[PDB]
């Protein structure tokens, strides 16, 4: 099979068209880059690690390396997991990367580094420096980037990673990087935007700093640029989860009217959270062709009324105006103005947060005629009132999202180291719907989903709540109070493809209470059901019934109970459902399966779920029973033994998933004549030695992909074969350097199955 | 001190003036009546256990027995911990009782007795029959109860113990037995009233039955009758979280004008759950002096809107109208009659569940002059608008709750086997207020305590929500989102005394943001202040302040980061502290006390509480800083090893709780010189042996209190003293029978330390 039994611990990928081999330490705890890297790699990963330091010897002989990622080698006091100490930073050599001719990026944060590293060749392209140390920036340290395209300074000096002084950049210290296009200064106690800068910038982000003033000069020679992040420069602090400085006199940022001059390509402006309290329409005067305009978490309630600056934004896609209320005014109604009708291209519009009491109709008026509007959201209003029949007029619409209201009948770019598929939506999840009236829901008939979850609904449905509801193809009823007395509940809901009725533990707890657990014959088109974590210990019903149904979760309930000792009423509780194929019975406190459930399995089921239950003995030569199952799992349980004879037991088995079980040994014919299967997983057992008997190459040549790891293996050598075979096959085995380790015997704990060579066996 | 070691399992007690001796073997699974019951017992009680069966050699020698209490050896199906079977029932052998010829009292509660007894005594006066399999009353069989006062034969047949046929009772079964004055036949598939009933009866029972009709010559004798329980026959069961069986065609129990016409000392009504749709003055003709009146879970939302019958009830107490509301009516208001204010001595109305929109000034303008009203209960109604001020009319109450609402800016008597008392209340718990408003609570002086808990308010108070409130004692706001930014927060409560934030974790949750814990210094009156399970971490202030708090809880958050190694910045956290007298820092997480925290503690501390730590090892020999402790709670932590002389360590030390520590063995001079203490625990450890050296009667003799029970004492003769004193000295020690058990050697596992007689340890 293999005679280059390569020990390297970090993956290896080859896409020869690319020309690229990427070699990944990511997560690895090296102490060192290891030797024998292949000089044929192009990019290389050595973030989250315990690397002391550079040197020109750590990338010697590789000249055909495009990528260093060398991230979070020593985490800032508070960026990182504290378990995870380096005694100090790291340090570079100088000409510690100069050897590299084909560079192209390297990133080099949350290292705790002072200032930036020199020497970097002249082909570099991208330099990512956030969460170190470097607060100021000169002119004669960027000599040497005069070629960058893409800079990262951001994180260096903020709350998480304070460095005690404002962010200082010398006169004209980017200005001659003349092919930069992106600059992230965020989150660097910076003050004033650092002119003056390439006329090349494309993106330039400045947000989160100590920015109070804009020049008439600031902006003024970037014309190619495109995307302008200036959000959380005087932020609005009340009750922010985070330390925030607000400006003084809780002035907003002062941006002069003809700031936004030069800035033609604008596409994207964000100016969330700067306290801003009007919004002239003297900024996008000369911005075009801006596409997203962010202006959350100010102070712009009073001009959303009025929001004149909206008629010079034609082309404007999104308008995030979330979060600006003002502090103790629950106002009547949401005021938005006649001027939300020009911006034609709109699609989304979010205005959570504009805290207000009733939702009625012609407050929508300007948006009625927005034809490629798609989302409205209208979440965390506490808006009380709201006829939801107002709203057969954004039929167009895609989303409708009505979430956390009341209605009845700093970073998110901080790269540390559903029902919109099925048409139109209604989002009334955590409201305060306490019954359902189909009067409600009338001149609703458009909508292809509705989500009712959350809104802690006890009825007993008897089939004519959602009677207007008639293309209705998703219905989220999660997290409420459903009474299933009636065989007839959802029976007028002709179309419903996906019913979720999970979290609906209420009445399905109470003992001697009818459980009409046969209300999906009448489903037709039924494709889903998930029903999971409702305590279902009884049912009324002897079976389930539906000739459409393809999913069924049944997870978190009480199957105990169901098929308890000697009690075979419950035992063909599902095998009327012709066409499932996928049955998610997990979590369910099954210890045993009573024999005889199997036989009352569905005919065309396909993938059987059996984790986290606590099956003390799961009979493996009843499977032959299901002779449709490619996918069963079995993780998270407490079984111990594993079947005679795999081929025996199922003909059809190709993903058995065993982790976390209790094994301590296979079979000696374990996978004997069992070709078909193609994927197993017996990762975190107690199994000890696996000899060959068991695992023919004849089988193991097909199979995709093979879990062992985090069990105990004592590596003594009672396990020739298996040293050979593990560090001489080709069948895929993750982790196969660091998780998989040896007990034993002694001397050789903790070692690797790869690094294993036992000389003295045969000597 | 003693020559009487009695070995009997169950408590005794002596009052001799009452001439009563109380032996009581509660939940004692004993599998026989133990020999030896002292001739001088008076009440015995024998409830849930593995008894047999009884004979006339059970109660052979007892003639001084007055009580007998048998109750629930064999619990039915459903009713008891189904860990515990009986084979069978239990067996009453003939003449069982006779002997008894004072017996006045016997409890055969839940004993699948299947007839009632025969042979009893003349002289019982009481008899308890519930959860028993008895539904068939013949005359015969009740010849021998012609004394009998009180009969309880409820839950015979119903849901959790069925007999599938109604009760059967023949004619004037109950009629000659003359002495009768409480009857209950609850929950016993009861289907007509059992005339004739004797005319001496107080308290007929008659609810959870299947009574459908009242006929008018059914109460037609009793005129001494004082209670009457008519409650769910013909229930209300949408929705009901029980099997509950309606009448046939929606029905309510029929009850003719004519029925409460004997009933003149008639004083509690209770006609809930009995599907009631009118209410006819006709009824309440002639009782005259009723005081209770039941009507909850009926359908008289429309009744509570005329409620006529109201003018005949001028005595009237109470009245619970709760949950009468429409299934699929939504009222805008609440409409309660002009006829309400003819109650005159009404103290408590609950209207719950009278499910409507908006509480308005005159909805509640009848109830502006009953001059005894207390309570007013108008929780669960889903109000939206409720102007608070309005309540400046109802000042003279006590309670105004207006829980679960959402305002913004079956038997109860199954015997199984706060803010009020500071004035004027205003309970807004679970409400939609999500900012505080000082405007909102105007005309609101008068409230001695307010309930905000629930309400989720994200706020950072700063001393002008609660203006006011001038008069406020108590305020709880557990449950919300408190931003602790500035000391002046409650600054304008002045006279408050109990301040609630617990489960406030939002903000005090992040880190970085200011948390001032010295709030508490412009409180000059505060005596309490609970903060628990605030997840507190940090705190801009360094200590707390307070001239007056006599009480703190601080359970629940995080003291280990706050008194973190080498931080000695919240060592004198408390100390300012000055009146504080009982501290209650548990569950914080400690692993260790920093040595230097007892000298930063306040003088008078009394009750130190340091249970669920994590305490590894608690020194003592700085206890002596505080010389006013009295009530050292250790219980739940992860000790190992008691101090060397409780006498060197405290002088004032009387409440060690020491209980589910690790403690393997006491010291040798424990309790050397240590008078002054008056109780231990510990109990649930691993002790093994405790020797005399360190446990000097001179010391026990004044021990009030003693545990050492659930713990690892093997019971060997090197503990020859040990079984001496503990079977011969009068130390209480609780449980010395069961649970304080014997680990070894071998033979003697599972011994009683009070059963140990090592004959042969000096022969
Ligand atoms: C004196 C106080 O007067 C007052 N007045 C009115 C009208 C309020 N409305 C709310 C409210 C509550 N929850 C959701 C809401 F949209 C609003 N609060 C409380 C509040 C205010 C600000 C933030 C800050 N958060 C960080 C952000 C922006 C916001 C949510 N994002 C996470 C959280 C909570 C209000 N407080
Ligand atoms: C077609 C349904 O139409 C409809 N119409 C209206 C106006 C309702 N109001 C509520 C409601 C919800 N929660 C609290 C409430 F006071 C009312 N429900 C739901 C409901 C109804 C009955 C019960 C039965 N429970 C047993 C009892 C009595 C009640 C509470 N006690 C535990 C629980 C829940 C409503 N359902």
Partial sequence: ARWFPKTLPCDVTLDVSKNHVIVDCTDKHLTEIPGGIPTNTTNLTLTINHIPDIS?????????????????????????????????????????????????????????????????????????????????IRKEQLTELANIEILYLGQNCYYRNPCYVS?????????????????????????????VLPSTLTELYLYNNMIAE??????????????????????????????????????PLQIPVNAFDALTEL???????????????????????????????????????????????????????????????????????????????????????????????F???????????????????????????????????????????????????????????????????????????????????????????????????????????????????????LDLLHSTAFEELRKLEVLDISSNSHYFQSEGITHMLNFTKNLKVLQKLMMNDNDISSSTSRTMESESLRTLEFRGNHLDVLWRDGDNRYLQLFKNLLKLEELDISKNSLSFLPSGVFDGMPPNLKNLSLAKNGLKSFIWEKLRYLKNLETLDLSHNQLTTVPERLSNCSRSLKNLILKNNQIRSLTKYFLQDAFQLRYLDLSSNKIQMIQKTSFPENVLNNLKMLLLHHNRFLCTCDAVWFVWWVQHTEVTIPYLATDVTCVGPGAHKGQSVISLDLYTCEL
């Fill in 214 to 251: 804009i020049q008439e000069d600031d902006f003024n020679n970037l014309n190619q640029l495109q995307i302008l992040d200036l959000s959380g420069n005087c932020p609005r602090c009340y009750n922010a989860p985070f330390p925030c400085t607000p400006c003084k006199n809780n002035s």
């Fill in 267 to 361: 596409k994207v402006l964000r100016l969330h959270s700067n306290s801003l309290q009007h919004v002239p329409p003297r900024w996008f005067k000369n911005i075009n062709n801006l596409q997203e305009l962010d202006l959350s978490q100010n102070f712009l309630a009073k001009e959303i009324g009025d929001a004149k600056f909206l008629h010079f934004l034609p082309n404007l896609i999104q308008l995030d105006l979330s979060f600006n209320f003002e502090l103790q005014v629950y106002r009547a109604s949401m005021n938005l103005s006649q001027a939300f009708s020009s911006l034609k291209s709109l699609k989304i519009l979010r205005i959570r947060g504009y805290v207000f009491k009733e939702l009625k109709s």
């Fill in 56 to 136: 020109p010897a750590s990338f010697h002989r590789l000249v055909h390396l495009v990528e260093i990622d060398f991230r979070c080698n020593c985490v800032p006091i508070r960026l990182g997991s504290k378990s995870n100490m380096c005694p100090r930073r790291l340090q570079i050599k100088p000409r510690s990367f100069s050897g590299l001719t084909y560079l192209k990026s390297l990133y080099l944060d949350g290292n705790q580094l002072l200032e930036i590293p020199q020497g970097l060749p002249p082909s570099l392209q991208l330099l990512s420096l956030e969460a170190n140390n470097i607060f100021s």
């Fill in 167 to 195: 962010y200082s950049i010398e006169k004209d210290a980017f200005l001659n990087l003349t092919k930069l296009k992106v600059l992230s200064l965020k989150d660097n106690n910076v003050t004033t935007v650092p002119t």
């Fill in 363 to 481: 407050q929508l008026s300007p948006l009625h005629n927005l034809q490629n509007l798609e989302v409205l959201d209208l979440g965390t209003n506490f808006i009380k009132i709201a006829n939801l029949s107002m709203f057969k007029q954004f039929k167009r619409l895609k989303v409708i999202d009505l979430s956390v209201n009341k209605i009845s009948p700093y970073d998110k770019y901080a790269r540390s180291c559903s029902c919109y598929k099925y048409g139109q939506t209604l989002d009334l999840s955590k409201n305060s719907i306490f019954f359902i009236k189909s009067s409600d829901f009338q001149h609703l008939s458009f909508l292809k989903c509705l989500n009712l979850s959350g809104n802690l609904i006890s009825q007993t449905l008897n089939g004519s709540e959602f009677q207007p509801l008639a293309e209705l193809r998703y219905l989220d009823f999660s997290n409420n109070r």
